[PDB]
Amino acid sequence: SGFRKMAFPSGKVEGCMVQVTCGTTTLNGLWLDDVVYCPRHVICTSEDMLNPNYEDLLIRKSNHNFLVQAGNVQLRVIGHSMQNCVLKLKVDTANPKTPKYKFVRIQPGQTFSVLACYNGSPSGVYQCAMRPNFTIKGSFLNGSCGSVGFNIDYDCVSFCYMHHMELPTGVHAGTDLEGNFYGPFVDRQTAQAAGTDTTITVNVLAWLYAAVINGDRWFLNRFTTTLNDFNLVAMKYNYEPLTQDHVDILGPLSAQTGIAVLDMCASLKELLQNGMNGRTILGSALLEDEFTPFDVVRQCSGVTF
Amino acid sequence: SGFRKMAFPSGKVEGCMVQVTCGTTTLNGLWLDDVVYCPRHVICTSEDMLNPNYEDLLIRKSNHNFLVQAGNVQLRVIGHSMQNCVLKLKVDTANPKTPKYKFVRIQPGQTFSVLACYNGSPSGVYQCAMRPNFTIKGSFLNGSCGSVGFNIDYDCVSFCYMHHMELPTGVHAGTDLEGNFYGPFVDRQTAQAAGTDTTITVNVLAWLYAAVINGDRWFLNRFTTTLNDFNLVAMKYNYEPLTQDHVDILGPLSAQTGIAVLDMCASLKELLQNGMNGRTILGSALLEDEFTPFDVVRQCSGVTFQ
Ligand SMILES: *[C@H](O)[C@H](CC(C)C)NC(=O)[C@H](CC(C)C)NC(=O)[C@H](CC(C)C)NC(=O)OCc1ccccc1
Ligand SMILES: [Cl-]
Ligand code: NA
Ligand code: NA
């Protein structure tokens, strides 16, 4: 028993992190097969970052302009190209620690583990969700660019995030490993802001189920609702609409606990309308929304990798 | 910016996790050099749970009664010994992935990462604190015994916890890697209960300094307090006493933010009195006490967002 915010074990990803240096800029790279992936803004001076012409700045650059360091071994760069906002550096040595892996683009509400790195060295691991506004509430300092987010399935690492920047509110924005930003952001120094976020309804419901499974039941009640009526409540409280697909995904937890999703929506409806009356759920005074239904089942099942 | 429950990268520990089986019982072991460490209660059977005599149970075992499995490879046990509540199995192969490591016994309030494992296979990583009542608030299912807690400050793994059992309130108890339990607990299934737990005051203060570092001051006030008046108030909310050691430990955070420790004590006293009036601190609506001063310095910028 117990319920904790849990990250995937990070060892398979630790063996892929390297340090990439171009000019005065050092950040982190992901070394898979014979290619190192990192943010393309590594080629930019501070002057360039105001209005960068990445095409022109890159063709200027050459292989020898890039220093890649794996531990204390220099990787010789033998090729360089761009894919969207990611720079790809071909090196002369395939990473012998390359795990089974895929590049995956995730949807808002989905969670993943972040391996925060500095100077190519893993520093910490934590769990976070892609927010509805396409930011992540990360924990990153200067030099963290190029840190990656991932999920594991058995032996396969699914890389879904590379870190590029911090927004003025302190939240974070990045790309998938193909260099496509999450959210309406660009890799230049210009006015940019997180849009108004919403709460991830299906994940709150998932966590309410986790609470019931762990013996927290005070919020349950005799009432049920409909999707239409609940979604009017959701809109009122800046919760994401609940769809039929969300209900289907929560099916397992509904069966296990005996609380139909619309039964639990009636609990959440009341929590949104009345508050928690001084009580906590799973040790929180807020409605937690960064556990997916899968996360709840995996932690309450003991899945290993 | 930002602030998260941040664990250490677990790879160095992943490469030490094995499966240990004795009889019908399977759990996790820690393979360092040519020794596998696991909970000694792997040698218990159904009848042995209330009043096991581990000396008598163990003398009946040969080396080949212990099956150790590292991934797909069966390791051969060539010796065994019991140290307190840990079994040490000598194997014929030194672990080639052994990291630099040490064994440390921690004090209540200290934090560490836990690599939850099942059948020798890692499941997930999270942060925990040793509570004042010598339990931890983990996430552990059947077969998690032998999972370990650790820190990795400066490329050396400091192992500080091995999981042995779950108490009735859902919290967890275990030992250091020398097999000595944290707290008054024993590896018997006789009735045992965690003592009333308390909040780790020095850690809450560390987390309030983190919030200031990250740019939020709304909770401060114009007051100060004596250490004794602070403790007289805080203990009425079931907070642990704050000692001069704790005050000294908070020095660096006080220096970086310009807020005297006892002035941050005054703020905490008022937070306990008032609540947050619908606000949060670093994304939480409760006062968080599982970040230590060292953890805050590890994770936060050295430059306050003034
Ligand atoms: C090992 O994987 C397992 C891990 C738990 C998280 C399940 N540990 C045990 O089974 C352990 C073995 C004994 C010999 C130390 N027993 C317990 O943890 C046990 C609870 C289990 C059966 C779920 N706890 C226990 O016995 O606590 C003492 C006690 C007894 C009676 C009443 C209250 C408390
Ligand atoms: Cl009804
Ligand atoms: Na209901
Ligand atoms: Na010790």
UniProtKB/Swiss-Prot annotation, chain B:
Inhibited by pyridone-containing alpha-ketoamides compounds 13a and 13b. In turn, alpha-ketoamide 13b (tert-butyl (1-((S)-1-(((S)-4-(benzylamino)-3,4-dioxo-1-((S)-2-oxopyrrolidin-3-yl)butan-2-yl)amino)-3-cyclopropyl-1-oxopropan-2-yl)-2-oxo-1,2-dihydropyridin-3-yl)carbamate) inhibits SARS-CoV-2 replication in human lung cells. Inhibited ex vivo by michael acceptor inhibitor N3. Inhibited ex vivo by compound 11a and 11b. It comes from the Viruses. The active site is at H41, C145. It catalyses: TSAVLQ-|-SGFRK-NH2 and SGVTFQ-|-GKFKK the two peptides corresponding to the two self-cleavage sites of the SARS 3C-like proteinase are the two most reactive peptide substrates. The enzyme exhibits a strong preference for substrates containing Gln at P1 position and Leu at P2 position. Residues 1-306 form the Peptidase C30 domain. It is found in: Host cytoplasm; Host Golgi apparatus; Host nucleus. Changing L205V: In strain: Zeta/P.2. Cleaves the C-terminus of replicase polyprotein at 11 sites. Recognizes substrates containing the core sequence [ILMVF]-Q-|-[SGACN]. Cleaves and inactivates human TRMT1, preventing tRNA guanine(26)-dimethylation of tRNAs. May cleave human NLRP1 in lung epithelial cells, thereby activating the NLRP1 inflammasome pathway. May cleave human GSDMD, triggering alternative GSDME-mediated epithelial cell death upon activation of the NLRP1 inflammasome, which may enhance the release interleukins 1B, 6, 16 and 18. Also able to bind an ADP-ribose-1''-phosphate (ADRP). This is 3C-like proteinase nsp5. The gene is rep.
